[PDB]
Each structure stands twice: as C-alpha cells, then as structure tokens.
C-alpha cells in the first residue's frame, strides 16, 4: 500500500560536526578501561539507518480492531480539552529547543518577544486557513552513545530525527498540548506507562502478576515502530482526538496538523536540499508519544482478542509493551503468541524478535528494564526495577570538550538506586569524583547531590539502602557487564566504597548522611538507618 519513505540520494547532514574523542578521559578512566568500546552514533551512518526503516506497509484491519477502536473513541468522548494561548504554548518551549528558520529561537519564544509572537500568529492563521499544503521538515541524525555489540554487528546506526520549524511546534501545542496531558490517561487508565515511577511500575506489574490464577507474561517491541505507522493509523488518531470535547478552532487546527504535518510531508537536510518524503510517523512532533502509545495500545488490545489472550493486563510505554494474562497451558500459550504476532503484523506492527511466553517475572523486559528481587538482611523479599548496566556505563564514560557525563551518572543513580550496580559502582564513583573536585554541593540539573539520601528514600523507600542479597540473573549480568567494559569487579568497588564512606563520614553534615545511608552495604557492622525527616517533607510527583 505505501512506503514509509522515499529518498533523493541527498546526504543526511550534521549540524555541529560530531567530535572526536580525546586521548584522555579524566573523569571516567578510573571507572572503566575499555574506552575503545564506547562510541557515539553519527550522521556518517544515517544512510544505513534510512535503509533499515524504508519498506512497504500493507495493513488489514478486522472486527477485533474495529471493536477496540469503538471502545477507545467512547473513552476519548469523556475528555474535554482546551486551547492553549499562543503565549502559554510559547512558555512550554524548552530552553534550548531548535531555533527557527525565521531569525529567532527559544529565548525569544519563552520571553514572548514581539517578532517571535508575531510570526507564530501568522503560522497559526495559515493553519486555520489552509488544511492541505504539506509542511516541510528537517531530518537529522540523533547522536547517542553505546557499548559496541559484536553479537549485534558492531555499531548501531544513528536514529533519525524529523521535525517541523519552531513556529509550527509552538502551534502544535496551542492545538494539542492539553490533549497530550489528558487523553492517554483517559483511554488507557492504569495501562499507561509514563505515569509511574520505577517503584510504582514494579508494584503494578506485581499486582497484575498476582491477580492471575496461573500467570503468563510477555513483552513485545519493535525497534522501528514509527516506520510502521500508516497514514490511516494517523488519521485514526485524529478521529480519536476529535471524539473529545474541543472548541471549534482547535478541531480545525488539529485537522490541518494531521493533514499537513503528521500524516507525512517532505524532508530537508540541514544543508537545505530536499532529502526525501515521509509517509509515516514523524520522530519529533508533539503527538509522537501520545500517538504511538495509543495506536500501539489499540493494535495490541485487538491482537489479544484475536489471539485469545485471556484476562490481559497491559503496560504500554510507547512502542514498548508488556502483557500479563491467564496462562492457558504452555502449548496453547506458544500458539496464542504466534497468533498475536500474526495479528500485530496484519495491523502493520511486526516485532523485533518474536515474543515468547514467560512464567517468571524476572525474565520479562520492558521500557528497556526488568523487575528483580533482593533479600533484606533477614529474609524479606524486596522487588525493584533494574536493567542491563552496559549502556548506562558506556554513557557514564562519554567525555568530550562539549559533553560531561556527571549528569548521566546522577540520573542513573536516582532511577536505579536500589540496584547493585548503582550502589556499588556508580554511587562509589560519583561521590569519589565530587569529593576530589570538592564540588560535593554544586547543583547538577537542579538536584543537589547531598540530598540523595532523602530523594532516594522518597522514591524507593528505605529498602533501597538495605538490599542484601541480589539474584543470580542480576549478579551474572552486572559482573559480566563490568568485565565487558574493563571496569573493576564488584569486590574492588567494595574497597573503593569503604574509603569513600569514611571520607563522607569525616566530612560531617549532609555528606556524613550520604556516607551512612548510601554506603551501609560497604561495612559488615551496619548502622541502623531510620526514616529521614528531610524526606517526608518532599514531593517529586513532577518527575514520573
């Protein structure tokens, strides 16, 4: 029926030319040794990407699909959404968002400068007047950092970014922002992935698992989900948006955005030549996350009914998806997943590798991570979110003239605080670097490191500081990842840890608390850690 992309042969071309690595990585050459293995995706590999993502889609919908859609549109109907003022939409632009072809950028937009405002007014008008002319976009290589995978053929090529001009982006929000805030929750309820913190994601999966008499779970991904989205899928999204109570202006606005932007349109490289034409999901438009999540949800829910998945509970993180249901016997279970996959494929949403039924929660991966179990010092099982540390570690080792990894360290420490690799490797390194630099309280991305104990307590609870015995899977993976990157093994970290712990303790104050709480696993004679008052008086609902 249609190709995801047509190309012209023009090259997809960098902005600020990707930078060579330096002969010394002073912040991380004591973290690991195999620096030769950490690499960053460049536009040089962008053709290789484009090939992987360009293919023919044909889609066959059915009664299950129709039925699911009817249900969702009824759900959407209960939502009412407002317009955002041009000004409000401007204020939601991020500080460093890509400046505009019309001599102004984010600072102007956020400060409501007259010409920025003015231009957007015209952009919005043209949207109201013209429902047809496709709106042009730029395509860029994403630069991300990985550890080399010999298994999966060396170096992943870059991801492709496709976005309209800043003027349009502001406009998108006037039209759709409020819907992005309300629609997903209303169509999917608890299935919606982005609402939860790690601990809550854990809890939900556990609850889901627990309520099946005889549970079975699987995850489904596709690497290339955007490519598989059809013009029709996109129009179906609009129709879903339209089932809401909107003002009329917004309805027009949305239709135009669908017809002129979302459904597809032409692509230019930064050099400014025509590069190709897109007939699938745009990587950088407002609706990308909402849209993928909803469309994925519709397709998956239909496919469950097609396959006879019994009593399914879903978690949806975009392209990424977990289903936990009632097992029907493993032989039936294997059959129903083949059927699910076949149905998904008819819907134009094939998988990466085919899914597989599992009967143990540790073996189920999604939003790139998994639930694991650790034993408190007296037997109690605690469950918590974790993942393969390889990428976190490669990212932790990426240092250039224009990039520092300390941020990346702290992000991981927070999200994965209960993990053995965070607690033994990253925590130990982070604190040691900051102490030597004497910047133990400079603020990184809005968080002060000396507040980790309370933040971690607030987020993960006091168990985060007493996970005593980790699982075989987890021990195996971590050890293995460390050997892979040439990082010291856990035993060496434990040493480093003891000395970090001491320095933090002698430093007194909040440092001493970091010492006591974060590094209690490092000493055989444990301090009794009690709740931090600093922590109850603290709200991070904002973050997850």
Curated annotation (Swiss-Prot):
Activity is up-regulated by PRK2/PKN2-mediated phosphorylation. Homooligomer. Interacts with non-structural protein 5A. Interacts with host VAPB. Interacts with host PRK2/PKN2. Interacts with host HNRNPA1 and SEPT6; these interactions facilitate the viral replication. Part of the replication complex composed of NS2, NS3, NS4A, NS4B, NS5A and the RNA-directed RNA polymerase embedded in an ER-derived membranous web. Residues 215-333 form the RdRp catalytic domain. Mg(2+) 2 binds at residues 221, 319-320. This is RNA-directed RNA polymerase. It is a single-pass type IV membrane protein. RNA-dependent RNA polymerase that performs primer-template recognition and RNA synthesis during viral replication. Initiates RNA transcription/replication at a flavin adenine dinucleotide (FAD), resulting in a 5'- FAD cap on viral RNAs. In this way, recognition of viral 5' RNA by host pattern recognition receptors can be bypassed, thereby evading activation of antiviral pathways. Binds 2 magnesium ion that constitute a dinuclear catalytic metal center. It catalyses: RNA(n) + a ribonucleoside 5'-triphosphate = RNA(n+1) + diphosphate. The chain holds residues 2443 to 2993 of 3033 of the full protein. It comes from Hepatitis C virus genotype 2a (isolate JFH-1) (HCV). Its cofactor is Mg(2+). It is found in: Host cytoplasm; Host endoplasmic reticulum membrane. The N-terminus is phosphorylated by host PRK2/PKN2.
């Amino acid at each position: 029926s249609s190709m995801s992309y047509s190309w012209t042969g023009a090259l997809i071309t960098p902005c600020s030319p990707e930078e060579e690595k330096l002969p010394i990585n002073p912040l991380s050459n004591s973290l690991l040794r195999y620096h030769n293995k950490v690499y960053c995706t460049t536009s040089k590999s962008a053709s290789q990407r484009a090939k992987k993502v360009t293919f023919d889609r044909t889609q066959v919908l059915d009664a299950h699909y129709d039925s699911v859609l009817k249900d969702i549109k009824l759900a959407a109907s209960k939502v009412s959404a407002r317009l955002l003022t041009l000004q409000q939409a401007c204020q939601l632009t991020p500080p460093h968002s890509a400046r505009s072809k019309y001599g102004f950028g984010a600072k102007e937009v956020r400060s409501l400068s007259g010409r920025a405002v003015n231009h957007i007014k015209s952009v919005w008008k043209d949207l109201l007047e013209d429902p047809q002319t496709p709106i042009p976009t730029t395509i860029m290589a994403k630069n991300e950092v990985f550890c080399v995978d010999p298994a999966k053929g060396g170096k992943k090529p870059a991801r492709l970014i496709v976005y309209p001009d800043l003027g349009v982006r502001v406009c998108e929000k006037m039209a759709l922002y409020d819907i992005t805030q309300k629609l997903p929750q209303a169509v999917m309820g608890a299935s919606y992935g982005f609402q939860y913190s790690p601990a809550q994601r854990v809890e939900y999966l556990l609850k889901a698992w627990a309520e099946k008499k005889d549970p079975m779970g699987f995850s489904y991904d596709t690497r290339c989900f955007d490519s598989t989205v059809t013009e029709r899928d996109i129009r179906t999204e609009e129709s879903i948006y339209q089932a809401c109570s909107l003002p009329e202006e917004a309805r027009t606005a949305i239709h135009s955005l669908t017809e002129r932007l979302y459904v597809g349109g032409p692509m230019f490289n930064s050099k400014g030549q025509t590069c190709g034409y897109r007939r699938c999901r745009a990587s950088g438009v407002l609706t990308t996350s909402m849209g993928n999540t909803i469309t994925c949800y519709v397709k998956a829910l239909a496919a469950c009914k097609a396959a006879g998945i019994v009593a399914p509970t879903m978690l949806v993180c975009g392209d990424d998806l977990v289903v936990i249901s009632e097992s029907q016997g493993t032989e039936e279970d294997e059959r129903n997943l083949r059927a699910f996959t076949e149905a998904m494929t008819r819907y134009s949403a094939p998988p990466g590798d085919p899914p597989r039924p599992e009967y143990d929660l540790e073996l189920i991966t999604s939003c790139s991570s998994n639930v694991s179990v650790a034993l408190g010092p007296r037997g109690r099982r605690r469950y918590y979110l974790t993942r393969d540390p390889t990428t976190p570690l490669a990212r932790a080792a990426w240092e250039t003239v224009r990039h520092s990894p300390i941020n990346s360290w702290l992000g991981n420490i927070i999200q994965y605080a209960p993990t053995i690799w965070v607690r033994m490797v990253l925590m130990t390194h982070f604190f040691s670097i900051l102490m030597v630099q004497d910047t133990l309280d400079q603020n990184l991305g809005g968080v002060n490191p000396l507040d980790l104990p309370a933040i971690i307590e607030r987020l993960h609870g006091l168990d985060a500081f007493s996970m005593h015995t980790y699982s075989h899977h987890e021990l195996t993976r971590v050890a293995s990842a460390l050997r892979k990157l040439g990082a010291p093994p856990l035993r060496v970290w434990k040493s480093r840890a003891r000395a970090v712990r001491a320095s933090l303790i002698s430093r007194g104050g909040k440092a001493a608390v970091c010492g006591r709480y974060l590094f209690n696993w490092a000493v055989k004679t444990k301090l009794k850690l009690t709740p931090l008052p600093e922590a109850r008086l603290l709200d991070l609902s904002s973050w997850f």
